[PDB]
Design a binder for this molecule. Structure first.
Ligand SMILES: CCCCCCCCCO[C@@H]1O[C@H](CO)[C@@H](O)[C@H](O)[C@H]1O
Ligand SMILES: CCCCCCCCCO[C@@H]1O[C@H](CO)[C@@H](O)[C@H](O)[C@H]1O
Ligand SMILES: CCCCCCCCCO[C@@H]1O[C@H](CO)[C@@H](O)[C@H](O)[C@H]1O
Ligand SMILES: Cc1ncc(Cc2cccc(CO)c2)c(N)n1
Length: 176
């Protein structure tokens, strides 16, 4: 389907275009608002669409050199697997009105948690040389990635709650 392919490409391109915005709170702590179009894609079109949009967004980050890349496996883990994992929100898609808020927040929560889980593992393995003085690798990664995860969920929550209320039909795909 052609409408699908193009929804996917548009939301992935929109994620990258959003990932161009300064979002650093402090050091490597970030508010990852660029996740939002992918989560929106996932919730509206289901898992597969989401994984694919996540995959596309990730490649875009890399090929334009906006990804932080220390190595093949690290970039694999953080710019393929991690953005793809947002598609997990697709398991929470609603196909029939009226749209409930609960599966939107439950899906959003779980998908960001999953992405940041992958960043947390990456922090431990590839990013510890950056840990603040006195901090082991695990504590530092939980701090950076736990906090960033939460702020991201928070922003994702604010924006999708607004969307649920003002434009609920964004989340329900129908023909016609
Ligand atoms: C090809 C392997 C890596 C490159 C990926 C393609 C880069 C362009 C993103 O995809 C394309 O986006 C265009 C703009 O939105 C659309 O014209 C088209 O519908 C869509 O398919
Ligand atoms: C919840 C998101 C808001 C975070 C914005 C903070 C940016 C970096 C941390 O700031 C610091 O905070 C310290 C403790 O308050 C101050 O003593 C210090 O002067 C200030 O540099
Ligand atoms: C860390 C990986 C997490 C994977 C867990 C995902 C399983 C949840 C799927 O259940 C779903 O509940 C939704 C609302 O609760 C409904 O919209 C949907 O129809 C139903 O299928
Ligand atoms: C400790 C630590 N520092 C930096 C990174 C790279 C990275 C890339 C994308 C998103 C995030 C979210 O914090 C982080 C990491 N995974 N762990």
């Amino acid at each position: 389907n052609v409408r699908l392919l193009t929804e996917i490409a548009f939301m992935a391109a929109l994620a990258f275009i959003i990932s161009l915005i300064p979002n650093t709170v402090y050091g490597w702590i970030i508010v990852e608002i660029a996740c939002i179009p992918i989560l929106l894609l996932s919730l509206r079109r289901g898992l597969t669409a989401g994984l694919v949009g996540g995959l596309i967004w990730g490649i875009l980050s890399m090929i334009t050199g906006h990804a932080y890349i220390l190595s093949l496996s690290q970039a694999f883990l953080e710019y393929l697997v991690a953005p793809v994992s947002l598609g997990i929100a697709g398991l929470f898609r609603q196909k029939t009105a009226p749209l409930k808020l609960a599966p939107v927040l439950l899906g959003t929560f779980v998908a960001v948690l999953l992405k940041y889980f992958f960043h947390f593992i990456a922090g431990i393995i590839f990013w510890s040389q950056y840990a603040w003085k006195g901090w082991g690798a695990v504590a530092y990664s939980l701090a950076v990635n736990g906090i960033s995860g939460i702020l991201t969920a928070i922003a994702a929550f604010v924006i999708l709650i607004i969307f649920v209320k003002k434009f609920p039909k964004l989340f329900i795909h129908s023909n016609y």
